[PDB]
Amino acid sequence: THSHGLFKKLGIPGPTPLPFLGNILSYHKGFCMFDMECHKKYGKVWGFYDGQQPVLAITDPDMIKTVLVKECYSVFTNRRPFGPVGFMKSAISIAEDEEWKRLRSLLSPTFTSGKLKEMVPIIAQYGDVLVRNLRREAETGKPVTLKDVFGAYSMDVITSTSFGVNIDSLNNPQDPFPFFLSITVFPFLIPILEVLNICTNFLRKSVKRMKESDFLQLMIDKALSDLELVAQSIIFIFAGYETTSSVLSFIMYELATHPDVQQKLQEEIDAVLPNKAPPTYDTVLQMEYLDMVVNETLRLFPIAMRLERVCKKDVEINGMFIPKGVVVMIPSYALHRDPKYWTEPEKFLPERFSKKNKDNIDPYIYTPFGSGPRNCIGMRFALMNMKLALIRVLQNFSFKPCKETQIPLKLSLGGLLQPEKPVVLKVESR
Amino acid sequence: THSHGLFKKLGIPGPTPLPFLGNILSYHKGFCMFDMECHKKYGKVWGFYDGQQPVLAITDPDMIKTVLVKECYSVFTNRRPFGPVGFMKSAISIAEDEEWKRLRSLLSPTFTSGKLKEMVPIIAQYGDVLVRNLRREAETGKPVTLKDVFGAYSMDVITSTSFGVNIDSLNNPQDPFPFFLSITVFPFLIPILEVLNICTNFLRKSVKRMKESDFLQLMIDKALSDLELVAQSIIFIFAGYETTSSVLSFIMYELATHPDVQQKLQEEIDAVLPNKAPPTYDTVLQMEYLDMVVNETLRLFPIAMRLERVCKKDVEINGMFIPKGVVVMIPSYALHRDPKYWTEPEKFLPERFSKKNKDNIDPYIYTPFGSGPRNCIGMRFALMNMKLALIRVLQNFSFKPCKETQIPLKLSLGGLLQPEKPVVLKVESR
Ligand code: HEM
Ligand code: HEM
Ligand SMILES: O=C(N[C@H](CS[C@@H](Cc1ccccc1)C(=O)NCCCc1cccnc1)Cc1cccc2ccccc12)c1cccnc1
Ligand SMILES: O=C(N[C@H](CS[C@@H](Cc1ccccc1)C(=O)NCCCc1cccnc1)Cc1cccc2ccccc12)c1cccnc1
């Protein structure tokens, strides 16, 4: 508990840290409730300890703009060190400084407006596998676990949008994937596990055997290793499955508990796409209410909850001294629910993002995809992927609450932003 | 042994590393013999592994100038990480990047030509305690352990040149101070010990109680903490004792085994200082042969043996790619004995440093005090301290080999550059 006097010195409020543990016992209600409580207890700026690690929480939109944008390349370049990783240290999400800058430029032309438009005719296939897999569980009046049929779709998308492998995700899906804590109170142990190779060889040799003799194309086309190829593929595999399915489950819960929004969305889909027209790249972007629903759900459920940057050297941002080594954190979940910015923040209201009202929204308060040079590189792909899925599903089915549907939806009091009970809804055919 | 293929990839020769251990088993003859052997086996550039840590050895004087001078602030700023340290991480010798740059500027005016000239009237006291402590062990024909009477002098110097405490170092000296290895093959364990406070509180509270209510003066006069004061004091205490005594023992051994040089030096001392005149700041600098003896001894015995810098990012120096994280090492001991630069290098010959021959010496081959911005900050003080001691001792005593004198002198086959057996010589009074 030696370094537990930093914020007392700097005159920054926060919860009193216990020795060794710091303030980690306060995570018993989850990161979200802890951040929402501290945002009320200490105001605009406070600090806590993840073990011996000082973490300063900031809410000033100017100070957030400074960290994420103005001083990204200079001071706030990297996220919190995460280990043990092994060869995955070369992943773009985990790499640091110059190595990250080289990876960012190398992987950036994957999600251009042109490369995304090339994927719309490809994504349109598994949307029909998604509907037909749902039409079976709908003609039988059997409630549907959404994350299963969504994850089956989300897995089909990422394997082909990046590589080209086509699999109906109801036969054998070759893609499998607590203790993830303790690292906080035992980071000294991270370099320890850095050597006993505790990092499966499943795609470590299978994806490594991407002989191919797309994102896989533009890579072999400084330079990039074939393993540097494996680690990035795993990263792009991580997001496009779990994030895509979890948000789509979050959307259908809110569309089920708010039937008025679900119908108003179905009316717009039939308008832009008459006769159940196939969704194209440009017709998806025309739908504004679909964008408002996705934006409002991501406000209530920012699947990242927090944004983090490591302060690599002493700085004085927006009139506040911040010492080297301190982790700067932006409580995305708490800011998305801050009543000082959102009227009735717990209520699902897509009209916050109407073009009449989308101007009263600060882009450093609503940050579902981060901000600055190190934002979510797969943002445009993710939004398009989820929107292409919502259109084809709502064009065919309507969703109603079931007997076993968790109303209201508890968030996972544990680590990652998921529901406690899975989202099960009744599916009816139009 | 995963990272044991770096030099095989780069096409750089070196000894084959065993798993986990790397090449540390080759240290069984000491760093010096290992460096001298590898300098012959692989030529101008080679690499080895300190456990899993790659260390690239360079001998090209241009590449040495690049690392130590041209690219010091940019790439080669810090030495190898050393731990566990505790609060001593703020020491100038251990600090890194900006924190070191702030410490360097803050402590640099301590060893100016003016501040050194203020210490000559102060150092002249304990030189007489050194002579009188020797005159007792000389009027009794009892051989003298040099490092005892030298360390007693060297301890008297550092306590007053920096603080002002006066003690005859034959009563109780309040200054006490293997496993130091393993860190190489167990650095993962360094952050581990970083928390169980394995770093005595002896001067940690005594020197901390430097109420004083000099180097201590110029400190309280960005800013500097009072603990930042303790750590630096300990650093300055480390060098001025052990380094000063060990080199003075190295000099008297060579002056004893080479009586012709010892007399030619005594003749110059009586010339510049007739009637055993007290040595002053300017009379010490006039003595060239005294400088040549000190320089030649430091060639045969560079007490640091090696210079090291951590390559903080990918670079291509003098036409050689060097990857991030690699430790760049300059084998000072091996270069000081390189026959490609020195004629009969094992032979003590102060005439190498005569002004007729001091021009045939490359300053990036002879580096007893390092080079560049991070050179030995206490160089000018150390040379003056040792020279002020040699003058007053040789003005009174002559030294001859004894029965138990180790001839030839074995170097310590262990870690730090010391003799195996201590240097014991017979002392006679002129
Ligand atoms: C609803 C979907 C998604 C959300 C809400 C989301 C959110 C985020 C957030 C908050 C960050 C951190 C930004 C920061 O710290 O400033 C991030 C980073 C990242 N995202 Fe996503 N993400 C989503 C989907 C995806 C997808 C489909 C990909 C496909 C490759 C992806 C790839 C990445 C990568 C590689 C990073 C690391 C960026 C870097 O380190 O340069 N994400 N994402
Ligand atoms: C015969 C006497 C001495 C020798 C041969 C010697 C040698 C060296 C060497 C080789 C280095 C490393 C240079 C490099 O890596 O480039 C160094 C650094 C250093 N020396 Fe000495 N030294 C001696 C005495 C002293 C004394 C009396 C002091 C008094 C304060 C001192 C203070 C330091 C410090 C603080 C550093 C670290 C420099 C930095 O990190 O900026 N040394 N010395
Ligand atoms: O990713 C989850 N935990 C991460 C751990 S780091 C790493 C994952 C990893 C790589 C190699 C070995 C072991 C693990 C990573 O590359 N992760 C972002 C990639 C997908 C992605 C995910 C989300 C948004 N966008 C892209 C921390 C984290 C959480 C949340 C948001 C983050 C945002 C940025 C960086 C780290 C973030 C995770 C979460 C839930 C289920 N499964 C895994
Ligand atoms: O210092 C010796 N071991 C060092 C270890 S790091 C540190 C010492 C320390 C600080 C705080 C906690 C524990 C240890 C240090 O501050 N050390 C240079 C200071 C004196 C000094 C010494 C020599 C020259 N000039 C100044 C590595 C090293 C060796 C040799 C030369 C180096 C040169 C530069 C940096 C590290 C060097 C050591 C050696 C022999 C006996 N006793 C201790």
* Distance of alpha carbon B156 from alpha carbon B123, whole angstroms: 9
Inform me whether the C-beta atom of residue B41 falls under 8 Å from chain A C-beta atoms.
no
Cα distances from A241 to residues A153, A306, A386, in angstroms, run 8, 20, 11
* Distance of alpha carbon B127 from alpha carbon B369, whole angstroms: 24
User: Cβ of A313 and B189 within 8 Å?
Assistant: no
Residue with tokens 């926060």: A14
| A79 burial level (CB within 10 Å; 0-12, 13-18, 19+) | middle
β A424-429/A144-145 pair status: antiparallel
* Distance of alpha carbon A370 from alpha carbon A306, whole angstroms: 9
SS3 letters for A158-208? HHHHHCCCCCCCCCCCCCCCCCCCCCCCCCCHHHHHCCCCCCCCHHHHHCC
* Distance of alpha carbon A66 from alpha carbon A318, whole angstroms: 8
Q: Transcribe A265-318 into DSSP letters.
A: HHHHHHHHSTTSPPP-HHHHHH-HHHHHHHHHHHHH--TT-EEEEE--S-EEET
Intra-chain end-to-end CA distance of chain B, in Å: 62
* Distance of alpha carbon B255 from alpha carbon B120, whole angstroms: 24
* Distance of alpha carbon B119 from alpha carbon B218, whole angstroms: 14
Cα distances from B259 to residues A70, B272, B344, in angstroms, run 69, 21, 19
Residue with tokens 């430790």: B327
Fill in the DSSP letter of residue B421: S
Best CA proximity match to A17, nearest among A56, A58, A47, A38: A47
**Phi-psi map region of B97: left, alpha, beta (phi>0 left; psi -120 to 50 alpha):** left
Q: Are B244 and B381 in contact (CB under 8 A)?
A: no
Three-state DSSP at B11 gives coil
* Distance of alpha carbon B16 from alpha carbon B10, whole angstroms: 14
Three-state DSSP at A411 gives strand
* Distance of alpha carbon A110 from alpha carbon A381, whole angstroms: 9
Residue with tokens 């018993």: A28
Cα distances from A22 to residues A1, A14, A178, A325, A421, in angstroms, run 8, 11, 18, 16, 30
Residue type, B14: G
Say whether the peptide bond before residue B408 is cis (omega within 30 degrees of 0): yes
CA atoms within 13 A on the CB side of A26: 19
CA B270 to chain centre: 29
From A2, A97, A187, residue closest to B191, measured CB to CB: A187
* Distance of alpha carbon A303 from alpha carbon A295, whole angstroms: 12
**Phi-psi map region of A6: left, alpha, beta (phi>0 left; psi -120 to 50 alpha):** alpha
* Distance of alpha carbon A328 from alpha carbon A53, whole angstroms: 11
Mutate to test the pocket of ligand 1, among A295, A369, A374, A417 (most ligand atoms within 8 A of CB): A369
Closest ligand 1 atom to Cα of A308: 15
Contacts of A274 (CB under 8 A, 6+ apart): none
Closest ligand 3 atom to Cα of A91: 16
* Distance of alpha carbon B354 from alpha carbon B292, whole angstroms: 7
* Distance of alpha carbon A400 from alpha carbon B266, whole angstroms: 105
Count of CB atoms situated within 10 Å of the CB of A141: 9
Q: Are A391 and A273 in contact (CB under 8 A)?
A: yes
Chain B residue closest in CA terms to A19 = B195
* Distance of alpha carbon A363 from alpha carbon A356, whole angstroms: 16
Which of B1, B3, B188 best tests the A interface by mutation, with the highest count of A CBs <10 A? B188
* Distance of alpha carbon B414 from alpha carbon B197, whole angstroms: 27
Inform me whether the C-beta atom of residue B2 falls under 8 Å from chain A C-beta atoms.
yes
Best CA proximity match to B253, nearest among B36, B421, B429, B30: B421
Crossing angle of helices B259-272/B288-300, nearest 10°? Answer: 140
Best CA proximity match to A174, nearest among A252, A113, A241: A241
Nearest CA to ligand 4 atom 12: B85
Token digits of residue B326: 């690699």
Token digits of residue A162: 């990046």
* Distance of alpha carbon B413 from alpha carbon B417, whole angstroms: 8
| Lateral strand order in the sheet of B424-429 | B144-145, B424-429, B397-401
* Distance of alpha carbon B150 from alpha carbon B137, whole angstroms: 13
Fill in the DSSP letter of residue B188: T
Q: Decide whether any atom of ligand 3 lies within 6 Å of the A377 Cβ.
A: no
Length of chain B measured in residues: 430
Residue with tokens 């109420």: B211
Residue with tokens 């027209």: A277
Q: Are A329 and A308 in contact (CB under 8 A)?
A: yes
Contacts of B151 (CB under 8 A, 6+ apart): B169, B241, B242, B245
The distance between the two most distant Cα atoms of chain A, rounded to a whole number of Å, is 68
Token digits of residue B166: 């006066």
Give kind and range of the element (H or E) at residue A330: strand A327-331
Count of CB atoms situated within 10 Å of the CB of A121: 11
Annotated binding site of A: 376
Best CA proximity match to A330, nearest among A29, A58, A100: A58
Q: Decide whether any atom of ligand 3 lies within 6 Å of the A198 Cβ.
A: no
* Distance of alpha carbon B53 from alpha carbon B325, whole angstroms: 9
Inform me whether the C-beta atom of residue B192 falls under 8 Å from chain A C-beta atoms.
yes
* Distance of alpha carbon B290 from alpha carbon B389, whole angstroms: 11
User: Cβ of B197 and A97 within 8 Å?
Assistant: no
Mutate to test the pocket of ligand 4, among B90, B92, B93 (most ligand atoms within 8 A of CB): B93
Give kind and range of the element (H or E) at residue A398: strand A397-401
Residue with tokens 């009237």: B121
Best CA proximity match to B311, nearest among B101, B90, B55, B62: B55
From A20, A191, A314, residue closest to B188, measured CB to CB: A191
Dihedral pair phi/psi, residue A354, rounded to 5°: -70, 150
* Distance of alpha carbon B420 from alpha carbon B416, whole angstroms: 11
Best CA proximity match to B54, nearest among B2, B14, B4: B4
Dihedral pair phi/psi, residue A58, rounded to 5°: -125, 145
* Distance of alpha carbon B31 from alpha carbon B306, whole angstroms: 8
SS3 letters for A363-377? CCCCCECECCCCCCC
Fill in the DSSP letter of residue A66: I
Q: Are B98 and A314 in contact (CB under 8 A)?
A: yes
From A2, A188, A314, residue closest to B191, measured CB to CB: A188
Residue with tokens 């899993």: B52
Inform me whether the C-beta atom of residue B194 falls under 8 Å from chain A C-beta atoms.
yes
Best CA proximity match to B328, nearest among B318, B343, B339, B342: B318
Best CA proximity match to B256, nearest among B411, B391, B146: B146
β B144-145/B397-401 pair status: unpaired
Q: Decide whether any atom of ligand 2 lies within 6 Å of the B119 Cβ.
A: no
Torsion of CA A252, A254, A257, A259, to 10 degrees: -80
* Distance of alpha carbon A128 from alpha carbon A124, whole angstroms: 7
Length of chain A measured in residues: 430
CA A19 to chain centre: 32
Cα distances from B372 to residues A188, A352, B309, B364, in angstroms, run 34, 60, 11, 10
Cα distances from B104 to residues A342, B40, B80, in angstroms, run 51, 37, 18
Crossing angle of helices B379-394/B227-257, nearest 10°? Answer: 40
Cα distances from B280 to residues A76, A91, B111, B119, B265, in angstroms, run 54, 63, 17, 10, 17
Residue with tokens 């000559």: B120
Q: Are B401 and B256 in contact (CB under 8 A)?
A: yes
Best CA proximity match to A154, nearest among A132, A129, A177: A129
* Distance of alpha carbon A15 from alpha carbon A57, whole angstroms: 12
Q: Ligand nearest A378 Cα, by number?
A: 1
Q: Per DSSP, which regions of B253-386 are E strands?
A: 306-310, 315-317, 320-322, 327-331
**Cα radius of gyration rounded to whole Å, chain B:** 22
From A98, A191, A313, residue closest to B98, measured CB to CB: A313
Question: Which residues share a beta bridge with A370?
Answer: A368
Q: Per DSSP, which regions of B359-423 are E strands?
A: 397-401
Count of CB atoms situated within 10 Å of the CB of B248: 26
Fill in the DSSP letter of residue A145: E
Token digits of residue B106: 């803050």
* Distance of alpha carbon B262 from alpha carbon B252, whole angstroms: 9
Q: Transcribe B95-158 into DSSP letters.
A: --HHHHHHHHHHHGGGGSHHHHHHHHHHHHHHHHHHHHHHHHHHHTT--EEHHHHHHHHHHHHH
From B192, B313, B324, residue closest to A188, measured CB to CB: B192
Contacts of A155 (CB under 8 A, 6+ apart): A167, A169, A173, A175, A241
Token digits of residue A36: 């929402």
Q: Are B47 and B54 in contact (CB under 8 A)?
A: yes
CB contacts of A189 in chain B (<8 Å) are: 192
For residues B168-206, one letter each, b for 16 or more C-beta atoms within 10 angstroms of the residue's C-beta and e for the rest, the string is ebeeeeeeeeeeeeebbbbbbbbbbbbbeeeeeeebbee
Best CA proximity match to A333, nearest among A416, A224, A420, A399: A416
Dihedral pair phi/psi, residue A251, rounded to 5°: -70, -45
Intra-chain end-to-end CA distance of chain A, in Å: 62
Judged by CB atoms within 8 Å, which residues 5-24 of A form the interface with B? 20
Which of B78, B195, B196, B226 best tests the A interface by mutation, with the highest count of A CBs <10 A? B195
Query: What domains lie within chain B, and their CATH numbers?
Result: 1-430 (1.10.630.10)
Residue type, A296: E
Fill in the DSSP letter of residue B201: -
* Distance of alpha carbon B61 from alpha carbon B181, whole angstroms: 30
Q: Are A57 and A45 in contact (CB under 8 A)?
A: yes
* Distance of alpha carbon A152 from alpha carbon A148, whole angstroms: 6
Inform me whether the C-beta atom of residue A98 falls under 8 Å from chain B C-beta atoms.
yes
Mutate to test the pocket of ligand 3, among A103, A235, A238, A417 (most ligand atoms within 8 A of CB): A238
